[model samples]
Each structure stands twice: as structure tokens, then as C-alpha cells.
Target: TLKVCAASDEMPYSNKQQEGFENQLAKILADTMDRELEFVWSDKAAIFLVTEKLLKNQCDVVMGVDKGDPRVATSDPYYKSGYAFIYPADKGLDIKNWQSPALKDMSKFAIVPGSPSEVMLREIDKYEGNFNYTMSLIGFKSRRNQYVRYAPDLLVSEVVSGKADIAHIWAPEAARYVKSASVPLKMVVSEEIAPTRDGEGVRQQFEQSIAVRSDDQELLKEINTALHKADPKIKAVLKDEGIPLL
Candidate 1:
């Protein structure tokens, strides 16, 4: 069996119902590998899925991992994803990229702390002003002391419900919400990022790979080969799931 590590609550990615895109892709991956697919579902956060599941030999593969993850042997990236701009389609907005001055004019910015978009907001000298606004998304609680976050769907809804003018979010995480919004919404890949002292648009799209125990070198190689064979179908799945590829 091709065992895949899964999370219970990561919608648009994985879930107990096997409705997320990752769950769908797992089936394809297993088919390509000519094996029966099995899920090793975890009730905890994703961070523990590696240490508490894969490392424990409860599963064989961890999907949607960064290529640079140090804890596991990773296959060549099967996908690339980046931050995106989400907004109401009916608005006549001139915002085109991270550098656009129009970005500063919008009120109630929907964003997550520490994301590349937050870096751009700081670069544009607007993050400070939005500090209280962002905090309000989670009731002004300290995000430092606890694990807290605004769900991607909530962030996307901030735009859809007209609670915010625009939202910058990791595209894949919010794509399903954008596609399902009651009113039309517009999504564009981020652009025109100016260089910082450290360089690059803070952090751009990242290569997403399949991660496995380092000792599973043979399985890793096989998975990489399977990834190549499943390329077209993978893109088809991404399209069907409303994910915007980089």
C-alpha cells in the first residue's frame, strides 16, 4: 500500500472526509505507483505529522511539503505555488502588484502575519496601521503565545463579504474559497515585487515536494518517477480543485 500522512482539518489540502485536493492526488499517486492507497490520518496540527506520524512509520509519504524541509528525504517538486491577490471582481481597482500604490489605499486588508504579503505591507509602510485590524480578525489575542490563525476561507471571505477591499493569501489554500464565493471574485498571482536588502520578493513561490523518511531512498526515487508520469493528471487535478499554479 502507498501510505500517505493526512491531517483531519486542513481543508483544500486534507481532511477526514478525503475531500481535499491532497486526498484526491493521493489516489492518483498510488495508482501511478501501482499500489493500494491508505491514509494515516492525524488529529494534530501538520507540524506533528512528520515527527509524530511519518517518523513513527505510521505512513510512507507526506504531501505538500517544502523541498527544503530538513527532516525528510524529498522528491523533486511536483507543484509550485505562490501568494495571490484576491478581490471583488466588480471593483475597478488598479492594483497590479506588490509595488502598486493602490494597495495602500485599500481598507481592512485581509492578511496573515509573517507572510510575504505582510513583508510587502511593511515595505509599503502599512503593516503597522493594519496591526490592530489584523488582530481584530482573531479578537486581539496574542498570536505569539498561542497557536492561532485566521482560516484561509475566513481571509478569502473578508473580501467576498465586503469586509475587506483585498486579501493576499497563499493561493492554493484560498483557491477553493475564491471559486465558491457567492459573488464573483478575482485572483491574480503576485507581481512586481521590489528587492530588499536580503533580495527577492521576500519569499516567492516555493517548490512543493513529497516527503518521506530519509532511509526510504528507494521509495523516494520511485515516487519521483511516479510524479513525472502523473504530471499531466496532477495539473488536471489542480485545475479541477481551482488551485492557481505558479
Candidate 2:
């Protein structure tokens, strides 16, 4: 029997209804492992407890951890994600080069809760002189299929409507939006950023790790084996679900 624990609140990632991507990963793990699959749910905010529970032998695996987190033994990166600068395509915005002159007349911006790209943008905001770039930022709390630009199709509608001048979001998510939006969208090129005094843009890519008990080397090995052999479809699934782009 294999017991797996995941967050209940994080949608497009994990949730109780088994609708999020992590739930799919869990279902796949369950089917392939030939073991009784069990789920222990917790809020995403306190989801680390799932790993703690795993250490206590309450679960065999903590279903989702970032690939960039150094705390866990991360498998090979299955995705690439960076901050994307999303804006209306008709605005004649210079997509190739990012400089103050480019964003001088920006209007509004939207960002997801847990993305590093948001932080990177804010640090640039502090400069104040770039692109005549005085802008209002709209921070959306991650609602079910509402805020994330990549997974929830609803958010893309918001971008297409010109409700926001820019949305700095996950790279894969930004890419997803480009495909569907009525107005064209582009991924903002990102440079490696240093952390600011306010603690923004400090960590470029927080890894998604498969967290297991420290002593559970056996289990870790098994999961890594799967990651190693994962086909393109499986890898794409992981990337779409917020795995770090290596």
C-alpha cells in the first residue's frame, strides 16, 4: 500500500476533488505502483505537514514539491518556467528588448501569488525611471482557476480583454495563454535577478521536489526512477503543473 499526501487548496496543481495536476500525478502513481493508493489532504498553506506526516510514516510520498527546492532530492527538471511579461500585442510593445523606454507608458499589471516573476517585476518597479513606467499592480489571490495565467482558462480571458496591460506569470502559463488569447501575447524575456532588500526576485527558480522522509531512500529511488524514464507526455504534464524549468 502506498499513502500519498497533497495540498487541498492549490488548484491547477492539487486539490481535494482530484481535479488538479498533482492529483493526476497521484492517480498515475497509484495505478503504476500496484499498491493501494491513499490520499491525505491538507491546505496548501500548511502542506509541509504532509512531508512531516510522511516522516512519521503516515504517508509514503508527499505528492508535489518544487523541483528547485534544495531541501529535497529533486529529480531532473521536467519543465522550464521563468517570468513572462504579458501585454496586449497591438500596443507596438517592443518584444525583443526590455528597457525603461519600452514600458514607460504601461497601464496595469496582474500576477499570480507564488511566482518569482512577480517579484522580479516589482524590483524593476522600484527603479521608477524605467519606461516612464509608473504602473498599478493587481495582485490576485490564487482562486480556483481564476488567477493562474497558465492552467485556468478564465484568467486568459482577463488578459485578452485588455483589463491588464501586463501579466508577469509563470513561463509555461504565459505560453499557454498565447495560444488562446484573441489578442496576441508574448513571453517577457527575463534576466537572472539578484534578491532585493524587500526580498523580491531573489530566488529565480524554486525547485519542485518529490519530498519523502529522509530515511525513505527506497521510496525516493523509486520515484526518481519514474522521472528518469518519463516519456514526453508525462514530462509535459509535470511542466504544465508548475515544475521548475531547469
Candidate 3:
């Protein structure tokens, strides 16, 4: 069996119902690998997946992670997703680039913490002004020793209610909610660049791949081969999810 590490409530990615894109891909990879699929569920945020699951030998693989995540060895990338600027369609807002002066005047921004969107906000000096609003969106959740995430739906709602000028979030994470929004929303893939803590440019597009503990070199290679065999089917699942491909 292929043991897949999954988060219980990371919507559009994974869930207990096995309806997310990652769940679909896990089935594809498992079939291609000639194994049955089994999920090792985690109640914690996905950020703890590598440490609490894969490294702990609780699962054989993590269904989705960045291509070069330092905590794990990765299979070949299957798809690309990126941060986007989401706003009401009627706003007539043209945020064409990261350096657009338009950002300076906007007082509120809806974004998930620790993503390129937040970093971009900081880079443009808008993060300080919007700090209170950002925390408020999450209802002032404590970020102590645990993972505290911004609700994907709430971020989109902020834009819908006109409480925020835009929601800067990952397209895949917010696409389903954006599409289901009662108010029409516009999504523009982030343009230009944001800086990483290491002084490298945060890429507008990020390739996503399956992950295994770093020492699992053999398993990583097998997964890479299986990913190649499952490529077409994998992409099909992504397309159905309305994911913006790169």
C-alpha cells in the first residue's frame, strides 16, 4: 500500500472526504505504483506534515509539497500553482505588477501568513498598515506553538464584502471558493516578484510534488517514475479543479 500523509481540513488540497485534488492524485500515483492507496490522517496543519508524519514513519509519502522542500526528498513535479490577486470583478483594479503604486494606497489586504503574498505585502511596505486587518481576518487566532492558518473562504469573503481591496492567496487554495463566491471575483496571477528571506526572488509559479523523508532516496526515485506514468491523469485532476497551470 502507498501510505499518503494528509491533513484533515486543508480544503481544495485534502480532506477527510477524499475529495481534494491531492486525494485524486494519490489514487493515480498509487495505481501507477501498483499499490493500494491508504491515507495517514493528521489533525495538524500541513506545515507540520513532514515532522509529525513522514519523518515519524507514520506515512510513506506526503501527497503535496514544494519541489525542493528541505525537509524531504521529492518526486518529479506534477503541477505548478502560484499566488494570485483576487478581487471583485467590478472593482476595475489593475494590479499588473508587484511594484504597482496602487498597492500603497490600499489599506487592507487579505492574505495567508508565511506565503509569498504576505512577503510581497511586506516588501511593498503595505504589511504594516494592514497588520491589524490581517490579524482580524483570522479572528485574532493565537500563533503560539501551533499552526494558525487564515481561512481560505474568509479571505475571499473579505474581498466580496468590500472589507478588503484584494485577497492575495494561492490560486489553488482559493480557486474553489473564488468560483463559488456569490459575488464575482477576478484573479490575476502575481506578476513581477517578491523577495525570499535568503534574498532570492520568490517565484510567481511554484511546482508541486510528492514528498518522502530525505533519506528515502530509493522511494523518491520510484515515486518519480510513477509520477511520469501518472502525468496525464494527474494533470486531468488539476484541470477539473480550475487550477491555474504554469
Candidate 4:
């Protein structure tokens, strides 16, 4: 059996009902290996998921981890994606990149806290008097096992509902919501905002991979093999999920 851990309620990614793309991908991997697929669901906080579920031996693998994460042994990258800006397509808010003159003059911006978007906002905020904008922080930051009422789509809602003029969001989350959004919207991959930290360039585009225990080299090898066979299906899932591919 191959045991997997995933977020119980993070939509377009994982859910308790196993309806998201990760769930589908997990099934494909298990089928490829001819192994039973099992899941242990938990809250989506990155640290809590790692410490409480993954490190505690509740499951053997976790999906959608960054490649080369120091905490676990990661498989070969399954996808490369980046942050996105989502706004009403009809309002002439078609800012294709982060460096657009449209951003500096935007009246209001909405963003999830502690995300790459927030980091970029901080970078932009450092310019002080150069830009005029208001930002609303939309999600909760928690370190506990309990799930908060955090939804990535709320940032999109802020704009669609006219509470904000623009939103900075993760490309995958934005992609998922934009498909079903009530209003016409367009997404622009903000590849232009490459902020630096500690003398190294911070990347908005990230390689997402699966994670296994650091000592579980054999399991990692088996997963890598299975993933190679399942690559085509995985791409299809990403496409269906509206993940912005790079």
C-alpha cells in the first residue's frame, strides 16, 4: 500500500472527498505501482502538515511540495508554475506583467497573507512614495492543526465583488477559481516580479514535486518510476485544474 497525506479542504488541490486533481493523480500513481492507495487527511498549513502528519509517520508521502525542500526527499519536478494577477477582463485591467503602470495606480489590491504575492507586495511597498495603493489581507495565518476558514479564491472574490480592483494570487489557485468565476476575468503570470532575499534571487515560478521521508530512498525511487509512467495523465490533470504551466 502507498499511504499519502493531503490537505483535507484545500480546493482545486485536495479535499476530504478526494475530488481534486491531486486525488486523481494519487490514484494514477497507485494504479501504476499496483499498490493500494490510502490517505491521511489534515489541514493545509505547510508546516503543520509536515510535522504532524508526514514526520509523525501518519503517511509516507505528501504531494505538491516544492522541489529541493530541505525537510524531505523530493521527487523529480512534476510541474513548474508561478504567481498570477487576476482582474476583470472587461474593465481594461489587462496588466500582463507585474511591472505594468497599471499596478502603481491601482486603487486597491487584495492578497493572501504569507504568500509569494505578499512578498512581492512588500518588495513593492519598499519603494515607499512611488506607488499609491491600498492592500487588504484576506487569509488567516495559523500554526495549529485546526483548519481556519481560509480560501484562496477569496482574493479573487475581492476583485470580482468590487471590494478591490486587483488581486495577487498563486497561479494554480487563480486558475482554478477563474474557470468558475461569475465575472469575466483574465490572469497574467507575474514573472516580472523576481524579488531577492539573502543575496539570492527569489523565484515566483516554482517546481512542484512529491515528497517522501528523507530516509525512504526506495519508496522515492518507486514513486519516481511510477510518476514517469503517469506523466501524461498528470499533465492532463494540471490542465483540467487550470494550473498555469511554465
Largest TM-score belongs to which candidate? 3
Using all chains and alpha carbons, the TM-scores for the candidates as numbered come to: 0.89, 0.67, 0.91, 0.88
Per-residue lDDT value at 149 in model 2:
23
**If the candidates were sorted by their TM-score against the true structure, best first, what order would they fall in?**
3, 1, 4, 2
Off by over 4 Å in 3: 139-150, 195-200
**Model 3, residue 91: displacement in angstroms?**
2.7
Model with the higher TM-score, candidate 1 or 3:
3
Off by over 4 Å in 1: 138-150, 192-194, 197-200
How well is each residue in 1-246 modelled by candidate 1, as lDDT tens digits?
A: 999999887787888899889999999999999999999988765656899899999999998788979999999998888788888886788766777777878767889876788888787777888888787674223655343323679888888888887898888899989989999998888753445645555765777899999999999999999999999998899988888777
Candidate 1 overall lDDT versus native: 0.83
Report the lDDT tens digits of candidate 2 across residue range 16-74: 79877667776666666556778877653334644456656666677655664545444
**Separate clash counts for every candidate:** 0, 17, 0, 0
Q: What is residue 128's positional error in candidate 1, in angstroms?
A: 1.8
Error of 4 at 168 (Å): 1.3
Task: Please report, in order, the local distance difference test score of every candidate based on alpha carbons.
Answer: 0.83, 0.57, 0.83, 0.77
Question: What does candidate 3's lDDT look like per residue over 1-246, in tens digits?
Answer: 899999887777888899877888889999999998999998887767889999999998998888998888987888888888888887677686677677777888998767787777887778888888887766333556355543587888888899998888888888888888999999888753565554678677788989998888988898999988878898888888878888
Candidate 2 wrong stretches, greater than 4 Å = 44-58, 68-71, 96-100, 113-115, 126-157, 172-183, 192-207, 238-246
Supply the TM-score for candidate 3.
0.91
Give the CA lDDT, 0 to 100, for residue 66 in model 2: 61
- Ranking of models by lDDT: 1, 3, 4, 2
